[PDB]
Ligand binder design. Structure first.
Ligand code: 3FL
Length: 222
């Protein structure tokens, strides 16, 4: 099924809310007249890869990729055989310098991280083909805020990775006495040298995980 049951159990209170029904209607109408990404079965891939209770790390994105075959419901990720986009190449580049033993998988599919409890959540979960931010402020933001809010209140010692000002705003209210928040610039080439290169978020995450008595992410398990 398209929406993981452990996530549904905790998020179902949102579904009957006025904003959510409206959002579903909006997306449905868009799909009738336009090509909308990701495909219908991949809007909620981020609920399918692990149990909600097993989340260890949260990487917040903004808008899904807007080109053919790119977005598949995990932020920054692209399925085989799609080449990693520039943002993702920069992520892999930082991994290579942050963690010597990291190995580039030769593809852009981040499912391996998702399975380990890395939540790869975009704030806005659909986009009209070729039109960045086309589905902005139509209700997704309230829903993904609800996901972040649940994790904030109902988990312990998560590491939140906030890349770029948009993600920083979205994670502004995270409880920093209960969770860890790491912030830097967005990995896109335009912003990557404003802090992302050298941020060392991946090793830092693993050390923070070990501080909470948790097993680290194998970032090369892709
Ligand atoms: O114009 C600017 O000032 C500017 C500069 C640097 C980054 C940004 C933020 N937008 C970059 C948009 C391209 C990434 N797309 C990759 C991506 C994929 C995904 O799934 N989620 C996400 O947030 N991003 C904006």
């Amino acid at each position: 099924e398209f929406f993981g049951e452990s996530w549904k159990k905790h998020l179902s209170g949102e579904f009957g809310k006025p904003y959510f029904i409206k959002l579903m209607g909006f997306v449905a109408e868009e799909r009738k007249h336009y090509t909308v990404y990701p495909p219908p079965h991949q809007v909620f891939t981020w609920t399918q890869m692990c149990d909600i209770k097993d989340v260890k790390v949260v990487i917040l994105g903004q808008d899904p990729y807007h080109g053919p075959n790119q977005a598949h419901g995990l932020c920054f990720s692209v399925q085989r055989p799609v080449p990693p986009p520039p943002s993702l190449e920069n992520i892999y580049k930082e991994l290579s310098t942050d963690i010597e033993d990291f190995v580039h998988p030769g593809h852009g599919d981040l499912s391996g991280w998702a399975k380990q409890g890395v939540l790869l959540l975009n704030a806005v979960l659909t986009v009209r083909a070729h039109q960045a931010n086309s589905h902005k402020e139509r209700g997704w933001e309230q829903f993904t805020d609800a996901v972040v809010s649940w994790l904030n209140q109902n988990s312990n010692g998560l590491v939140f990775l906030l890349w770029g000002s948009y993600a920083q705003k979205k994670g502004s209210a995270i409880d920093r006495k209960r969770h860890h928040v790491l912030q830097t610039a967005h990995p896109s080439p335009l912003s990557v040298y404003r802090g992302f290169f050298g941020c060392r978020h991946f090793s830092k995450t693993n050390e923070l995980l070990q501080k909470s008595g948790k097993k680290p992410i194998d970032w090369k398990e892709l």
